[PDB]
Amino acid sequence: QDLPGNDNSTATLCLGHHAVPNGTLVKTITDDQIEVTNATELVQSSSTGKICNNPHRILDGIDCTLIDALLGDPHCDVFQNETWDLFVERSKAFSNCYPYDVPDYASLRSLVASSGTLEFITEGFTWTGVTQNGGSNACKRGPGSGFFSRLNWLTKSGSTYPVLNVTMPNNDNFDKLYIWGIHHPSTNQEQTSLYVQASGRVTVSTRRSQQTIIPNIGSRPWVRGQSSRISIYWTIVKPGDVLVINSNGNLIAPRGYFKMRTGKSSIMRSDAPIDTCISECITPNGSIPNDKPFQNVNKITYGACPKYVKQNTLKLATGMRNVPEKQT
Amino acid sequence: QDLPGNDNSTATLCLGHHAVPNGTLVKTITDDQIEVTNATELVQSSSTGKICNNPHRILDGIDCTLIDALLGDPHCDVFQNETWDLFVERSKAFSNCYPYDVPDYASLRSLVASSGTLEFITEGFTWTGVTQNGGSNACKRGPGSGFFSRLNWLTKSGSTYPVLNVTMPNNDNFDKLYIWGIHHPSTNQEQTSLYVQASGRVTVSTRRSQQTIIPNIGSRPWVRGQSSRISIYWTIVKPGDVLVINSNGNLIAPRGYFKMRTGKSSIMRSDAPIDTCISECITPNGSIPNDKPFQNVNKITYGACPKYVKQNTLKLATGMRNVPEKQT
Amino acid sequence: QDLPGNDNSTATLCLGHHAVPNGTLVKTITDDQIEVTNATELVQSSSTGKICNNPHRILDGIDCTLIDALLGDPHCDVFQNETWDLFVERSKAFSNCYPYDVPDYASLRSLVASSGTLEFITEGFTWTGVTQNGGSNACKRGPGSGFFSRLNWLTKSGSTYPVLNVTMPNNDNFDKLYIWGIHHPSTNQEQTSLYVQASGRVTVSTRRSQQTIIPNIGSRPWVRGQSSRISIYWTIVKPGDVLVINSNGNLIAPRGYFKMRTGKSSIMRSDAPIDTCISECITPNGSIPNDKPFQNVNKITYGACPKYVKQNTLKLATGMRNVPEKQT
Amino acid sequence: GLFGAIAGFIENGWEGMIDGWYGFRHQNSEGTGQAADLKSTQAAIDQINGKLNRVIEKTNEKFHQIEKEFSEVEGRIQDLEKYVEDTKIDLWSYNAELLVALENQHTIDLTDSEMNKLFEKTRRQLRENAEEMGNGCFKIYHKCDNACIESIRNGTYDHDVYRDEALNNRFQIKG
Amino acid sequence: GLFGAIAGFIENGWEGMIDGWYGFRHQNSEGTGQAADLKSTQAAIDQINGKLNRVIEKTNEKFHQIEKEFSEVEGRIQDLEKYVEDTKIDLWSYNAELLVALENQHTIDLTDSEMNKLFEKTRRQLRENAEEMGNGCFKIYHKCDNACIESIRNGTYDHDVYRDEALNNRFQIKG
Amino acid sequence: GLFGAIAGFIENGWEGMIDGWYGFRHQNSEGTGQAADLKSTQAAIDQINGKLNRVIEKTNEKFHQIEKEFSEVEGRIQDLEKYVEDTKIDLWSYNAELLVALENQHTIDLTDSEMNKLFEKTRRQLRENAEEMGNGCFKIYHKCDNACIESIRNGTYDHDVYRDEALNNRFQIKG
Ligand SMILES: *[C@@H]1O[C@H](CO)[C@@H](O[C@@H]2O[C@H](CO)[C@@H](O[C@@H]3O[C@H](CO)[C@@H](O)[C@H](O)[C@@H]3O)[C@H](O)[C@H]2NC(C)=O)[C@H](O)[C@H]1NC(C)=O
Ligand SMILES: *[C@@H]1O[C@H](CO)[C@@H](O[C@@H]2O[C@H](CO)[C@@H](O[C@@H]3O[C@H](CO)[C@@H](O)[C@H](O)[C@@H]3O)[C@H](O)[C@H]2NC(C)=O)[C@H](O)[C@H]1NC(C)=O
Ligand SMILES: *[C@@H]1O[C@H](CO)[C@@H](O[C@@H]2O[C@H](CO)[C@@H](O[C@@H]3O[C@H](CO)[C@@H](O)[C@H](O)[C@@H]3O)[C@H](O)[C@H]2NC(C)=O)[C@H](O)[C@H]1NC(C)=O
Ligand SMILES: *[C@@H]1O[C@H](CO)[C@@H](O)[C@H](O)[C@H]1NC(C)=O
Ligand SMILES: *[C@@H]1O[C@H](CO)[C@@H](O)[C@H](O)[C@H]1NC(C)=O
Ligand SMILES: *[C@@H]1O[C@H](CO)[C@@H](O)[C@H](O)[C@H]1NC(C)=O
Ligand SMILES: *[C@@H]1O[C@H](CO)[C@@H](O)[C@H](O)[C@H]1NC(C)=O
Ligand SMILES: *[C@@H]1O[C@H](CO)[C@@H](O)[C@H](O)[C@H]1NC(C)=O
Ligand SMILES: *[C@@H]1O[C@H](CO)[C@@H](O)[C@H](O)[C@H]1NC(C)=O
Ligand SMILES: *[C@@H]1O[C@H](CO)[C@@H](O)[C@H](O)[C@H]1NC(C)=O
Ligand SMILES: *[C@@H]1O[C@H](CO)[C@@H](O)[C@H](O)[C@H]1NC(C)=O
Ligand SMILES: *[C@@H]1O[C@H](CO)[C@@H](O)[C@H](O)[C@H]1NC(C)=O
Ligand SMILES: *[C@@H]1O[C@H](CO)[C@@H](O)[C@H](O)[C@H]1NC(C)=O
Ligand SMILES: *[C@@H]1O[C@H](CO)[C@@H](O)[C@H](O)[C@H]1NC(C)=O
Ligand SMILES: *[C@@H]1O[C@H](CO)[C@@H](O)[C@H](O)[C@H]1NC(C)=O
């Protein structure tokens, strides 16, 4: 094509790849550690230490558990009608009112925690022939003795206690949660003094369920001056159904209903400080970022969080094999 | 080899692959959508809308739930001794007999639904000194008042109600399921009228278990004229054991046993029409074909069904990369 | 470079791989069976048939279940204060003392089995005004009639069964497990003979929980001469809390506490012989080696065991494809 | 893909090839023409069906299970029933998503591989008589009529027959 | 890796190449010199980001679940709550562990592949004018000045231009 | 497999090779010989043990779990206990089944790759002195005695030594 050259030589062309002096070992199908040019961590292993107050409604329980906030322990009266995406229970929380127990506490803490609202509606119940508004020095409200703001302790009028038999229709289009209870006196004398009859009974029913509890008389350990206990129970009433409360003693009556809603609310136990920042994944240890696919901070999470894993580091190689010349 | 030719020429041979004008995008490890020549859907996402009546015994409950079919609500008397691979409960189903409740309804619906048979054997129980066959206008059987076909309501004889104490040995080689109950009167007068004693008791035992229920007196919501309730209970009796029923009031007695069997029977809630066709995978939405490995129709399935998945399409490439002549 | 040679020839070099005459078929992503030169089994499918007595403390229950060993059936008195990593229950095991039942037997078998110790501490309870140490001919201890070594059957002293009301503080720094019970008499005469009052009651409480049981009078099936039953219950008492036992009849009192510990102990039902060898993975079928990653011997395992799988063989090819020239 | 033939050194596919997945196009002194390769097409198809069947393999049948829909609020045990099924579903969803991602990746490289193996196999057969124009086309340096092209394709081409012609014709020095 | 280029027939990497992942060093008529290849660097980088994004894809959000820590001993139902979560965790841990093992394996072979494809692509372009020294270096048998080297690298080298020179220079017989 | 060497361009394996996985057979002036290649045998063996150990890695130990066998009919909670374990087992069974399928696939291509790499490596060393007969055999175009064969195999063959001989002997035109 061109003409005979007066020179005759050759050239060398060599193909090659880069290499870095440092380089990270990564796991393989055939190798446990092999060095690549670069990698990324896929396990998130540290929290900030604070629960960010944004985007979810984080309600600090402070020294109230959700059940005392529900029942209306005087010292928790601050939470009335509160609302939350996450209720945080603090380990410092205490109760300070009449000694109660909740047989199946765990479901009541769950189904309220998921509802996410404490909106209470007072209904006009009529208790005929009994003394309303009983209270106790084990639950002071101010200088006075008192009781849970949402429950009504019925004792005898004059010298007798009738068979209470009341009804409250669910005429609304939503479910109504009713919290009620029963008082287990310490002695047979306490029983007859307060409720006249030697054995009370509570039957709370809807047309689809019924529960009858009879009180249990006996000494229990002194808690705030009391050896008696009240035990808490719940009844959900579906739209169009009816609540019927029948009792001839020891009833701790409801003052109306809590609204129930379907939501994304939950409860968490954490003593992490709440601080102002935005983060979607919350953990009892504080928030964590959700840029990585797996996390190892805590298996308890709320929100858009990485899948919890056992491993605390898992490196995805984002580079070729590192085969250095000069080395590190 | 051959001799010097008079023509001198060359040829061109080119290797290549096909390509299609259309082509499907598919997911990869390194790509979210990349186009291949052809693919297949692995997620089954549509139902026919009908439950095929073949190969499984599908029993339409029509307007009977399995528990009313078990107890023998008059309107469900059609199901006596029926048998099923799948009992279908319809949402239209109602009850129409004495108001009852089943504490732990959910296990009784389960363990009957799995047994798959309602075969009942009447045993000759002898109730001495009580009036048998009580019924109620809340459960009409024909023009008359009546009761569950499989339970026997015992009321007093004139003046008295004795302590019933009866036995029925399990002499067969299979387990026997006994369904029984107790009546919770609305008033103390109802109690004494029917059962004489002011408080009844039921203890039902085998030599390995015992349950004592005491009735609960109180007003409940009017359901079919009644404010009283009966509550249902079950006792399985293993071969060679004994049933002993002891009671001095409020017993709703068994009339014999249901056979229990080990099977592949279950229950499903569906208003899908049953139609004549054969299909192995049933879903509340109707049957679905099980040619694909995953399905997205419903997480509730019965039979040979695809694994339910969240994705609603997942395409497996069954062809090479599509690189068309005038790129698409 | 070198000088012109007088010979002109060529050579043949051929590259190749080995092949074996035998060769194993293995599964692939594109093939169900393809033959490779060699493979390894990854599913462990056989047991030795014996539970090796090493490294874990395997306690043979012989003819005692853990609950009878706990309660102190005379024939199980051998296990007092025993300790285990694995308690093995034998199917031959029987009970031979007063007929009892444990409502929620399954949790009591669990929480003791996990604690791993039966260390019992006798506490000085004072039962005032009642006769201690009752026993029964249905539970002989030696020629005499007797009762569970760890429970104390209280019957009235003279003309009275007083209201027992006793306390035992948890002053130690560990949790104490108390096992107690209640006696359900066969007849109303048995009730009044033993406990005077026509209806006993037991309330056992801590300052955080309370349970009241009332007895259930009625005939049950004859078991070792008895138609009565006792039912067992448990109360854990946390450090610094108090047990309070209040009763006016039918109490089967505790004689002190079992220590509870956090461990790696469990219970297993197996009639496999225990033999002397060391093995880490135990299965009801005997020990199995844990060199393979998956096992198919039994889904019930204790210790360092392979993940149970449904497959009974899964061969990992450890060689190239086998392409023989002769074949067979 | 891994081998760099499909969508690599072969700039694009032929929509015209309706009779096979891989094949040949030639221009020789008789004319131009095209033909599908059936052995490599069958090789790619068999492996793809192989994996397709293993995926379409045995559905497991399940009968009485747990309830997955509830009409009342119950609390603790229902919370668990919901958690067991929701965690089962996310684990099976992950599983289907990784399966088709791995599978699809492997199918694009498998068919990339078969294109490359046909090419290499053809290269070895032509020995010193052809040169790679580097775009999937070999230039054959000797008169190759249609029977010559059929022998290459059906795999019976004898390179020695035309070696001296091709070689002379190839290492011509003249510009 | 599978192709045997990186850590294979190319004895090692160049720490000196700060401008790309694959590239050329040359020795020639007017010096020595090096240059990153950007098309193969971008190809390796795009695929690695491709998989990286698919892994960094959607976190699932969960709200009210089951309790994972307990303060009292309850027995049967708590035993189950613990078993459900412990088995969920080991299944997800296995899952992350297999994912980065497969992924890492594939990334080392993918970048091995791109080294090999650049090499092969360069080979095809030089036609009969260069020989493979078998160490990643081609010996070019004709005077190739810096523009000649830039045409090879930018992919426009015309082999015919220097074929007679190279060929003559290559099949010299003289010792 | 992906590279088309084993069960590909190498028609079959040698049952005779008892001393290694890959190797050479030759005919030369001094007679015929066979010899295992140890570097490629060790390479294939090391990778296969590599994966074998990662699979034989840590068994997890579990102690008190949930009950998996029942003697009475209980209903709701037992139904759940059964569902949790049955879903755990199918998830682990799927897991073992995909693991050995992926693994086995990769092992057949890994050993396919090593055959190919030995072949290619040998090719590069022979430079212009041999031609590929396309069946795994190189035809060497110069007298290559047993030391010549040992230098190719131990990797010290100097192609320049025999280039003029081979080249002359190769591009003979005479029929
Ligand atoms: C049944 O037995 C229990 C224990 O013997 C009796 O309980 C004890 O009752 C006294 C008052 O009668 C309680 O005293 C007060 O305790 C607080 C806390 O230390 C202290 O601040 C007060 O100044 C006073 O000492 C004592 O704590 C309480 N102990 C327990 C464990 O509850 C109970 O009275 C008996 N019941 C009957 C009806 O006999
Ligand atoms: C306890 O309180 C409840 C509510 O006050 C009382 O229940 C009510 O009793 C009357 C009959 O005495 C029921 O009337 C019936 O209504 C239906 C529907 O129209 C009708 O078909 C009947 O002919 C009859 O009129 C009323 O529905 C019922 N309400 C509820 C919610 O159950 C109950 O009587 C009180 N019990 C005692 C013992 O005082
Ligand atoms: C309530 O009804 C049951 C059944 O009718 C009565 O139980 C039976 O009572 C007799 C003794 O009175 C038991 O006899 C025993 O038989 C065994 C075994 O053969 C023998 O070893 C003993 O020496 C004794 O004689 C009989 O087994 C028992 N049957 C059952 C199923 O428990 C019970 O007495 C009635 N109760 C009342 C208070 O009326
Ligand atoms: C390492 O990889 C990550 C993800 O690809 C990337 O952000 C980072 O820049 C890489 N490092 C270097 C030095 O390229
Ligand atoms: C709670 O909400 C209800 C409904 O709006 C209202 O009537 C009631 O007074 C509220 N109570 C408080 C303390 O907010
Ligand atoms: C998170 O919290 C748990 C429980 O407090 C603790 O065991 C764990 O180590 C913590 N992890 C981090 C990263 O803080
Ligand atoms: C696409 O793939 C499926 C499964 O391999 C097959 O049935 C169908 O025929 C394929 N399409 C074409 C056009 O080959
Ligand atoms: C139910 O089956 C039993 C056993 O064969 C039989 O005696 C009984 O009469 C049957 N009842 C009906 C309505 O089929
Ligand atoms: C199936 O049924 C469920 C419940 O009725 C519904 O949410 C779902 O969308 C249905 N899917 C199909 C494919 O019909
Ligand atoms: C087969 O593979 C296993 C694991 O690599 C090994 O122990 C055994 O020796 C191999 N068999 C042969 C014949 O090499
Ligand atoms: C059980 O252990 C306690 C604590 O050491 C001891 O006092 C008691 O006597 C022991 N009983 C037996 C039979 O070992
Ligand atoms: C192990 O034991 C179970 C239950 O006894 C039995 O079904 C299974 O077949 C046994 N397997 C072996 C390998 O012994
Ligand atoms: C290949 O084609 C030639 C003609 O070019 C024919 O003679 C020969 O028989 C064919 N061989 C095969 C195996 O088809
Ligand atoms: C390649 O380099 C040459 C000089 O060697 C230049 O003339 C030509 O334009 C370049 N082509 C491209 C596409 O950069
Ligand atoms: C290779 O073989 C030759 C003889 O052909 C011998 O002289 C040389 O030392 C050997 N080299 C190695 C590295 O074994």
GROMACS .gro file of C-alpha atoms in nm, chain D:
model
  175
  985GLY     CA    1  -2.235  -1.166   2.907
  986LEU     CA    2  -1.918  -1.333   3.037
  987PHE     CA    3  -1.787  -1.437   2.699
  988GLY     CA    4  -1.845  -1.120   2.505
  989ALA     CA    5  -1.982  -1.280   2.190
  990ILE     CA    6  -2.359  -1.197   2.202
  991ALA     CA    7  -2.391  -0.823   2.227
  992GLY     CA    8  -2.011  -0.825   2.213
  993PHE     CA    9  -1.784  -0.903   1.922
  994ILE     CA   10  -2.095  -0.991   1.730
  995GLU     CA   11  -2.249  -0.648   1.692
  996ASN     CA   12  -2.615  -0.769   1.673
  997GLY     CA   13  -2.856  -1.055   1.609
  998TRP     CA   14  -3.033  -1.153   1.292
  999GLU     CA   15  -3.413  -1.120   1.298
 1000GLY     CA   16  -3.406  -1.304   0.974
 1001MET     CA   17  -3.294  -1.633   1.121
 1002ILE     CA   18  -3.623  -1.807   1.177
 1003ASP     CA   19  -3.488  -2.162   1.188
 1004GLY     CA   20  -3.245  -2.175   1.484
 1005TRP     CA   21  -3.072  -1.975   1.752
 1006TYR     CA   22  -2.715  -1.968   1.616
 1007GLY     CA   23  -2.609  -2.000   1.253
 1008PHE     CA   24  -2.404  -1.888   0.958
 1009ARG     CA   25  -2.414  -1.621   0.681
 1010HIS     CA   26  -2.163  -1.637   0.392
 1011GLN     CA   27  -2.073  -1.464   0.068
 1012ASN     CA   28  -1.883  -1.690  -0.178
 1013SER     CA   29  -1.832  -1.676  -0.560
 1014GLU     CA   30  -2.162  -1.858  -0.618
 1015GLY     CA   31  -2.360  -1.620  -0.396
 1016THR     CA   32  -2.461  -1.518  -0.045
 1017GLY     CA   33  -2.681  -1.739   0.187
 1018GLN     CA   34  -2.770  -1.822   0.551
 1019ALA     CA   35  -2.827  -2.143   0.755
 1020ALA     CA   36  -2.916  -2.221   1.120
 1021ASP     CA   37  -2.678  -2.433   1.322
 1022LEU     CA   38  -2.886  -2.704   1.485
 1023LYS     CA   39  -2.637  -2.859   1.728
 1024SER     CA   40  -2.566  -2.536   1.911
 1025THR     CA   41  -2.932  -2.439   1.897
 1026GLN     CA   42  -3.025  -2.772   2.053
 1027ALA     CA   43  -2.749  -2.733   2.315
 1028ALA     CA   44  -2.878  -2.395   2.428
 1029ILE     CA   45  -3.241  -2.510   2.421
 1030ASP     CA   46  -3.178  -2.829   2.618
 1031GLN     CA   47  -2.997  -2.647   2.898
 1032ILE     CA   48  -3.268  -2.383   2.920
 1033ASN     CA   49  -3.537  -2.655   2.941
 1034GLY     CA   50  -3.323  -2.836   3.192
 1035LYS     CA   51  -3.337  -2.545   3.431
 1036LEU     CA   52  -3.696  -2.467   3.345
 1037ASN     CA   53  -3.808  -2.811   3.454
 1038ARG     CA   54  -3.617  -2.813   3.774
 1039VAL     CA   55  -3.801  -2.487   3.864
 1040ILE     CA   56  -4.141  -2.624   3.754
 1041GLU     CA   57  -4.068  -2.930   3.981
 1042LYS     CA   58  -4.283  -3.059   4.265
 1043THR     CA   59  -4.537  -2.839   4.433
 1044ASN     CA   60  -4.562  -2.930   4.796
 1045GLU     CA   61  -4.917  -2.988   4.916
 1046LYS     CA   62  -5.038  -2.863   5.245
 1047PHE     CA   63  -5.376  -2.921   5.402
 1048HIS     CA   64  -5.491  -2.798   5.747
 1049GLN     CA   65  -5.257  -2.513   5.843
 1050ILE     CA   66  -5.303  -2.201   6.064
 1051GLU     CA   67  -5.561  -1.924   6.015
 1052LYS     CA   68  -5.440  -1.630   5.816
 1053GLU     CA   69  -5.735  -1.393   5.851
 1054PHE     CA   70  -5.906  -1.282   6.174
 1055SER     CA   71  -6.232  -1.104   6.252
 1056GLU     CA   72  -6.175  -1.002   6.612
 1057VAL     CA   73  -5.891  -0.856   6.813
 1058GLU     CA   74  -5.732  -1.109   7.039
 1059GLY     CA   75  -5.383  -0.990   7.129
 1060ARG     CA   76  -5.088  -1.216   7.201
 1061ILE     CA   77  -5.156  -1.546   7.025
 1062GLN     CA   78  -5.305  -1.378   6.716
 1063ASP     CA   79  -5.009  -1.140   6.699
 1064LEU     CA   80  -4.789  -1.454   6.674
 1065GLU     CA   81  -5.009  -1.623   6.411
 1066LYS     CA   82  -4.974  -1.307   6.201
 1067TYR     CA   83  -4.591  -1.287   6.257
 1068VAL     CA   84  -4.531  -1.651   6.163
 1069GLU     CA   85  -4.706  -1.613   5.830
 1070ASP     CA   86  -4.568  -1.272   5.749
 1071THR     CA   87  -4.217  -1.396   5.811
 1072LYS     CA   88  -4.282  -1.711   5.603
 1073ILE     CA   89  -4.399  -1.496   5.312
 1074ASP     CA   90  -4.108  -1.254   5.311
 1075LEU     CA   91  -3.866  -1.547   5.323
 1076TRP     CA   92  -4.036  -1.716   5.025
 1077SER     CA   93  -4.055  -1.384   4.837
 1078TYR     CA   94  -3.685  -1.327   4.884
 1079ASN     CA   95  -3.637  -1.677   4.765
 1080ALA     CA   96  -3.828  -1.632   4.438
 1081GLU     CA   97  -3.662  -1.298   4.371
 1082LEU     CA   98  -3.306  -1.433   4.412
 1083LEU     CA   99  -3.390  -1.747   4.212
 1084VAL     CA  100  -3.492  -1.570   3.890
 1085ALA     CA  101  -3.210  -1.314   3.930
 1086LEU     CA  102  -2.943  -1.591   3.951
 1087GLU     CA  103  -3.118  -1.801   3.688
 1088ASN     CA  104  -3.155  -1.513   3.435
 1089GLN     CA  105  -2.799  -1.410   3.483
 1090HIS     CA  106  -2.686  -1.763   3.413
 1091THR     CA  107  -2.909  -1.798   3.105
 1092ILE     CA  108  -2.768  -1.486   2.940
 1093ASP     CA  109  -2.410  -1.618   2.998
 1094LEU     CA  110  -2.498  -1.974   2.896
 1095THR     CA  111  -2.630  -1.860   2.556
 1096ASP     CA  112  -2.329  -1.617   2.537
 1097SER     CA  113  -2.111  -1.923   2.590
 1098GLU     CA  114  -2.277  -2.128   2.317
 1099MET     CA  115  -2.228  -1.846   2.067
 1100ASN     CA  116  -1.864  -1.837   2.162
 1101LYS     CA  117  -1.821  -2.218   2.146
 1102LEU     CA  118  -1.969  -2.233   1.790
 1103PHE     CA  119  -1.735  -1.955   1.690
 1104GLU     CA  120  -1.429  -2.124   1.841
 1105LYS     CA  121  -1.522  -2.459   1.701
 1106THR     CA  122  -1.553  -2.308   1.356
 1107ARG     CA  123  -1.220  -2.132   1.404
 1108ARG     CA  124  -1.038  -2.455   1.488
 1109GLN     CA  125  -1.172  -2.629   1.182
 1110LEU     CA  126  -1.054  -2.363   0.936
 1111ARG     CA  127  -0.695  -2.397   1.061
 1112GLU     CA  128  -0.454  -2.173   0.855
 1113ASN     CA  129  -0.699  -2.099   0.580
 1114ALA     CA  130  -0.900  -1.821   0.733
 1115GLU     CA  131  -0.851  -1.511   0.933
 1116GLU     CA  132  -1.078  -1.363   1.193
 1117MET     CA  133  -1.210  -1.028   1.082
 1118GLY     CA  134  -1.292  -0.986   1.449
 1119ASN     CA  135  -1.662  -0.931   1.410
 1120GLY     CA  136  -1.781  -1.288   1.403
 1121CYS     CA  137  -1.675  -1.327   1.039
 1122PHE     CA  138  -1.393  -1.543   0.910
 1123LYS     CA  139  -1.234  -1.448   0.582
 1124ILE     CA  140  -1.158  -1.776   0.398
 1125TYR     CA  141  -0.848  -1.738   0.175
 1126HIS     CA  142  -0.932  -1.991  -0.096
 1127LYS     CA  143  -1.217  -2.047  -0.339
 1128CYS     CA  144  -1.492  -2.196  -0.124
 1129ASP     CA  145  -1.801  -2.290  -0.325
 1130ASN     CA  146  -2.132  -2.387  -0.168
 1131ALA     CA  147  -2.023  -2.744  -0.097
 1132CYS     CA  148  -1.715  -2.609   0.075
 1133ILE     CA  149  -1.944  -2.391   0.292
 1134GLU     CA  150  -2.169  -2.697   0.363
 1135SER     CA  151  -1.869  -2.899   0.471
 1136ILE     CA  152  -1.761  -2.631   0.720
 1137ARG     CA  153  -2.110  -2.611   0.859
 1138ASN     CA  154  -2.174  -2.988   0.872
 1139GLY     CA  155  -1.828  -3.015   1.019
 1140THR     CA  156  -1.642  -3.221   0.767
 1141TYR     CA  157  -1.417  -2.950   0.612
 1142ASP     CA  158  -1.067  -3.081   0.536
 1143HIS     CA  159  -0.826  -2.799   0.576
 1144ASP     CA  160  -0.536  -2.978   0.410
 1145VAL     CA  161  -0.724  -2.984   0.080
 1146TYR     CA  162  -0.701  -2.608   0.049
 1147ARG     CA  163  -0.407  -2.526   0.277
 1148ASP     CA  164  -0.147  -2.449   0.001
 1149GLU     CA  165  -0.398  -2.233  -0.188
 1150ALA     CA  166  -0.510  -2.042   0.118
 1151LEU     CA  167  -0.163  -2.006   0.265
 1152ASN     CA  168  -0.018  -1.872  -0.060
 1153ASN     CA  169  -0.315  -1.643  -0.106
 1154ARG     CA  170  -0.282  -1.531   0.257
 1155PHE     CA  171   0.085  -1.446   0.290
 1156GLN     CA  172   0.105  -1.253  -0.034
 1157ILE     CA  173   0.324  -0.944   0.006
 1158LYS     CA  174   0.223  -0.674  -0.244
 1159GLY     CA  175   0.079  -0.335  -0.202
   0.00000   0.00000   0.00000
